[PDB]
Amino acid sequence: DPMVSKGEELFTGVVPILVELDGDVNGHKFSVSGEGEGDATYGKLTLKFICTTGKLPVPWPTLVTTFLMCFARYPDHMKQHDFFKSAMPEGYVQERTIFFKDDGNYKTRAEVKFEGDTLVNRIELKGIDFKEDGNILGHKLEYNYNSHNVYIMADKQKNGIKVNFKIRHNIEDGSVQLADHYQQNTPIGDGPVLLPDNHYLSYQSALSKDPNEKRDHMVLLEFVTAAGIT
């Protein structure tokens, strides 16, 4: 399929990645830079993020979703449902509202696209209505991350997709902070895109620290595999 071919030819090997985020949560301003690489053959991403403005005013785990679904491994039987690669190289827009149960919300807008051989994720994040002493602004969230399925459906009328899912972040008292994600993606280009049957992406995410890094940062390892269309 010459369409399926165009995304294979873009993602076949290891692709360098750059991430840039500008944040404002309750007027707490911050900037994060990320670098690393994806290998969609293995559904694999390796990234390191640095808060370049000092202390990150929110927990790192709250940002993991915001900080690359074009790097999903879609099994061979499922290549015709891979919207994300299909939008490339022109890229797509990923928008979210993320409602933290009993606390504030994030509204995110991202542009995911190639800048030459580099896959780039440019993000703006605005957070509003947080409790200065809640789980988020009071940094009560554990530095860890659970596995989660993410459910994709077409949004035919917008030539794109909608994605809905919940993340439960562990609190340090042993309870969980719910983070209910609503998402929409739309291609940046005017060309055809692959619009998927309902399926899901399975995520595993491991958070770590770079022993020689003094800035406030996060090392993120993610594996992402499409499923749910046998």
Tell me, what CATH number does 158's domain have?
2.40.155.10
Evaluate whether 35 touches 48 at the Cβ level (below 8 Å): yes
Rounded CA separation 228/77 (Å): 11
Rounded CA separation 120/105 (Å): 25
Q: H or E element: which one contains 139?
A: none
Half-sphere exposure of 186 (CA within 13 A, CB side): 11
Which are the contacts of 43, defined by CB distance < 8 A and separation ≥ 6? 71, 72, 73, 223, 224, 225
Q: What are phi and psi of 7, to 5 degrees?
A: -75, -35
Q: Report helix, strand or coil for 77.
A: helix
Q: Which two tokens stand for residue 176?
A: 């969980």
Amino acid identity of residue 67, one-letter, is F
Q: How many of the other CB atoms lie within 10 Å of CB of 187?
A: 21
Q: In angstroms, what CA-CA distances link 147 with 73, 100, 189, 207?
A: 16, 18, 32, 12
Q: How many of the other CB atoms lie within 10 Å of CB of 137?
A: 19
Rounded CA separation 97/104 (Å): 11
Token look-up 């409602």 returns 99
Rounded CA separation 181/63 (Å): 12
Query: Nearest Cα to 119, choosing from 186, 57, 46, 203?
Result: 46
Query: Nearest Cα to 30, choosing from 129, 119, 114, 124?
Result: 124
Q: How many of the other CB atoms lie within 10 Å of CB of 156?
A: 9
Rounded CA separation 112/121 (Å): 5
Query: Nearest Cα to 222, choosing from 46, 20, 17, 33?
Result: 46
Q: Report the largest interatomic distance among the alpha carbons of the chain, rounded to a whole angstrom.
A: 54
Enumerate the β-bridge partners of residue 61. Answer: none
Chain centre distance of CA 177: 19
Resolution in A: 1.4
Chain centre distance of CA 61: 12
Query: Nearest Cα to 150, choosing from 104, 92, 199?
Result: 199
Amino acid identity of residue 207, one-letter, is L
Q: What are phi and psi of 172, to 5 degrees?
A: -65, -25
Full residue range of the structural domain in which residue 225 is found = 1-230
Amino acid identity of residue 111, one-letter, is E
Strand 118-128 to 15-25 pairing: parallel
Q: Report helix, strand or coil for 209.
A: coil
Chain centre distance of CA 153: 17
The number of folded domains in the chain is 1
